[PDB]
Design a protein around this ligand. Structure first.
Ligand SMILES: OC[C@H]1O[C@@H](O)[C@H](O)[C@@H](O)[C@H]1O
Length: 397
């Protein structure tokens, strides 16, 4: 009987509802799922539990993982042999995924698939409670200046403008979206892809921290330590106007029967045809036993299934990684995501989220998040923040 231990951080809400599609498909194929959930938004907690399980030679069969962390484990030598690469080849994953997604999924210097992608999340979203914006005569903002004007108006009317939880990854999520709009595509690429010292520490970055300082004043006293899905719930219930968060938030809206255009408004954060992508993927470790290897090969195949990725993503709030899945049954926000992905692609605006593990190894992600969260939760000047950011990145290299 095919078996797999699966380590992930999808422990409630729209996340669990989407995961259930995969768990149900696996059991239907007589697969035995050993659940290994590790609660913690953005997966930093999962990454700590995973790391300790590997260093202890107790690798799970499959683990939720992002981008360069895949290759980091590969370089450890804990992944090969690449038993799922045979699945990938037979099914022609190379013609079903974008060059960029495909490259993320490979081990052995780009030669063998060792992880399966299920989706593409987008980071650069604003979610708004529609009755709140209508009640206050506010149009969904398209610029930070429109957002700040709207936030002042809502605050003066006694409404929390921005529902947010201040945890390091969650502060970084807002930050990266802000950076893309305040600085632009090349700036974002230079800072978080190239790690250009001048760009990190310079005047455009200062302006990013200026906008972070504004956003802090729009949050509420319960923010520190708050989980992201609590913040989404605040918008859902009209206890706050806005949330700036990836489209896993749309998993919550959908799971509570709210619809874009009727109960809430989804609009990208300001950018110049930018798109910040995030691919949930599962790596398959070197594991002992033929039943576990059959588990891995079965999971890989299911995760890349055509119908699966349609259904999973409708619930999850993301769009399919698979290039040939019909977007037709998806909502307005997912279609905007798909469209903007194609549009950003051609303009050089399609960029990896760093806060969600696609741009950078965890060491570089950690270094940045820690400075961002320190600025956000203190009275640090924007200049000082940018100087500290550049230095922490530099020291992390
Ligand atoms: O925890 C909130 C989100 O964290 C992301 O990094 C992950 O890719 C999403 O699937 C969702 O789980």
């Amino acid at each position: 009987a095919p078996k797999a231990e699966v380590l992930h951080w999808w422990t409630g809400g729209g996340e669990a509802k989407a995961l259930k599609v995969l768990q149900d498909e696996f059991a239907a194929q007589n697969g035995v799922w050993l659940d290994m959930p590790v609660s913690g938004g953005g997966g930093d907690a999962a990454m700590q539990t995973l790391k300790a399980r590997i260093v202890a030679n107790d690798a799970p069969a499959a683990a939720q993982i992002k981008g360069p962390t895949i290759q980091e484990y590969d370089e450890e030598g804990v992944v090969a042999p690449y038993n799922i690469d045979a699945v990938a080849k037979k099914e022609g994953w190379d013609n079903l995924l974008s060059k960029q997604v495909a490259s993320h999924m490979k081990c052995d210097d780009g030669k063998a698939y060792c992880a399966a992608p299920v989706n593409i999340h987008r980071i650069d979203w604003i979610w708004a409670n529609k009755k709140v914006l209508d009640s206050n005569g506010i149009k969904m903002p398209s610029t930070w200046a429109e957002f700040n004007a709207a936030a002042d108006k809502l605050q003066a009317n006694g409404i929390i403008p921005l529902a947010h939880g201040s945890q390091p990854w969650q502060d970084a999520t807002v930050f990266e979206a802000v950076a893309l709009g305040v600085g632009g595509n090349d700036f974002y690429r230079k800072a978080f892809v190239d790690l250009d010292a001048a760009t990190l520490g310079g005047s455009t970055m200062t302006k990013v921290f200026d906008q972070m300082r504004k956003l802090k004043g729009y949050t509420d006293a319960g923010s520190p330590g708050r989980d992201w899905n609590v913040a989404t719930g605040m918008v859902m219930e009209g206890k706050a106007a806005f949330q700036i968060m990836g489209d896993w938030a749309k998993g919550e809206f959908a799971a509570n029967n709210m619809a874009p255009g009727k109960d809430y408004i989804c609009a990208p954060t300001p950018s110049n045809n930018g798109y910040l992508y995030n691919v949930d993927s599962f790596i398959f470790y070197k594991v002992k036993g033929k039943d576990k290897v059959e588990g891995q090969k079965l999971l890989a195949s299911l995760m890349m299934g055509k119908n699966f990725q349609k259904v999973f993503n409708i619930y999850k709030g993301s769009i399919p990684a698979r290039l040939d899945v019909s977007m037709d049954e998806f909502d307005m926000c997912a279609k905007k995501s798909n469209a903007d992905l194609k549009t950003a692609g051609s303009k050089g605006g399609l960029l990896p989220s760093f806060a969600h593990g696609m741009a950078l190894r965890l060491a570089q992600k950690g270094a940045i998040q820690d400075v961002v969260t320190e600025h956000f939760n203190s009275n640090m000047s924007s200049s000082d923040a940018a100087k500290k950011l550049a230095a922490a990145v530099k020291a992390s290299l």
